[PDB]
Amino acid sequence: CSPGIWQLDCTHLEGKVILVAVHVASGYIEAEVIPAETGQETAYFLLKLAGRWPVKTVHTDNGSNFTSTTVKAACWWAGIKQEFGIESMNKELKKIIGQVRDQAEHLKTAVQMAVFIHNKKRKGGGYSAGERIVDIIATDIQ
Amino acid sequence: CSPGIWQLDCTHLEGKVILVAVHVASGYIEAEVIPAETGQETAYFLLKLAGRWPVKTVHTDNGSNFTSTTVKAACWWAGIKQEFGIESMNKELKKIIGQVRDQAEHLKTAVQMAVFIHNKKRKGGGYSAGERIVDIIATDIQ
Ligand SMILES: Cc1nc2ccccc2c(-c2ccc3c(c2)CCCO3)c1[C@H](OC(C)(C)C)C(=O)O
Ligand SMILES: Cc1nc2ccccc2c(-c2ccc3c(c2)CCCO3)c1[C@H](OC(C)(C)C)C(=O)O
């Protein structure tokens, strides 16, 4: 799968909104709890994501997520295109969030604990998602 | 320089607070505009950072940044130690922020544009910071 492809969705938990990005090739995730499910929050999240990784295309399971002018501006500026030509991790990450939830006060804190647990887990049968993304991208540079 | 070492500081711009993390070995940056210069914001930022990269030690130019129990809890949970045994990028990133500032409404938007510009720049004399971090970490896995 192309190293430049990401998937972005929002899930809902405890009346809050979790924006989840998945690097499709590796299974690596990054997430944030956002104060509203809005184009502006999506646009801002995409700018951060694009500054870190070489983001070429983004897919989502809710196409209307990407109609706002604010999202279109962020994909224009960062040189991102929509991927139409294509988990849920939102289940497995939700599973981890449930497992750690009582260990933190704020949902956002549990989310980041779950991201960390997910990305560091050896998928032995055996590198972790965090190891795979770095390998996939580094290899693609060369 | 060790691949696990990061530097974290806050700068101030327009009465807001910018938390800046630098991966010392590569020059890669990540940043966020935070609503207050507080231990809780620092702790939360460290949890996100640690879920993405293999963070072993963190340095800062203001040691009192790391005294709060909330920061100590985040370094405990994520397995991070303080680096005492050690730019400013906060100048060069501030320079880029100034260069793009009028192109965005919100300071936070300009910050992320400046992060993106910084990380993608070929340092030809020639890989970018974003390319170096991924190479440094991938190589260290192997
Ligand atoms: C509100 C809060 N108050 C505290 C008071 C004293 C000590 C720790 C905390 C923590 C905390 C910090 C790191 C951490 C975990 C919890 C749980 C394990 C991972 O590391 C939080 C957390 O909130 C912030 C992260 C925003 C500070 C939380 O939601 O519980
Ligand atoms: C508030 C705001 N309103 C808009 C209305 C219409 C079109 C775009 C925007 C943008 C925007 C989006 C992406 C982007 C840039 C600006 C500037 C170039 C990089 O990409 C913003 C920005 O704010 C958010 C990012 C939170 C939406 C901003 O601060 O200007």
Cβ A78 vs Cβ A91: under 8 Å: no
DSSP A68: S
Q: A63 to chain B nearest CA, in Å?
A: 24
**Pocket residue to mutate for ligand 1, from B19, B34, B37, B40, most atoms within 8 A of Cβ:** B40
Structure tokens at A140: 């693609």
Q: Count of A–B CB contacts within 8 Å?
A: 75
Solved with? X-ray
Strand, coil or helix: A18: strand
- 3-class SS string, chain B: CCCCEEEEEEEEECCEEEEEEEECCCCEEEEEEECCCCHHHHHHHHHHHHHHCCCCEEECCCHHHHCCHHHHHHHHHHCCEECCCCCCHHHHHHHHHHHHHHHCCCHHHHHHHHHHHHHHCECCCCCEHHHHHHHHHHHHHC
Give the Å distances, CA to CA, from B49 to B11, B14, B29. 18, 25, 11
Experimental resolution (Å): 1.9
CB A21, CB A49: distance < 8 Å: yes
Whether residues A109 and B44 touch (CB distance < 8 A) is answered with yes
| C-alpha to C-alpha distance for A100 and B38, rounded to whole angstroms | 24
Which are the contacts of B4, defined by CB distance < 8 A and separation ≥ 6? Answer: B54, B55, B56, B57
Q: Closest approach of chain B CAs to the CA of A36, in angstroms?
A: 17
- Strand order, beta sheet including A57-59: A28-34, A16-23, A5-13, A57-59, A81-82
Q: Name residues contacting ligand 2 (CB within 6 A).
A: A 40, 43-44, 47, 69-70, 73-74, 77; B 103-106, 109, 113
Query: A20: part of which helix (H) or strand (E)?
Result: strand A16-23
Could you give the domains of chain B?
Answer: 1-142 (3.30.420.10)
Partner-chain residue, chosen from A30, A44, A116, that has the shortest CB–CB distance to B108: A44
A66: CB partners within 8 A, 6+ apart: A42, A58, A60, A72, A75, A82
Contact B78 A116 (CB under 8 A): yes
Contact A19, A32 (CB under 8 A): yes
Q: How far apart are CA B104 and CA B116, in angstroms?
A: 14
Q: How far is B9 from chain A (nearest CA, A)?
A: 18
Which ligand is closest in space to the CA of residue B115? 2
Give the separation between CA B68 and CA B38, rounded to whole angstroms: 9
Which of helix, strand or coil describes residue A61? Answer: coil
Going by the DSSP 8-state scheme, the letter that residue A121 receives in this structure is: -
Residue A9 annotated as part of some ligand binding site: yes
Q: Compare all CA atoms of chain B with the CA of A31 and give the residue at the minimum distance.
A: B48
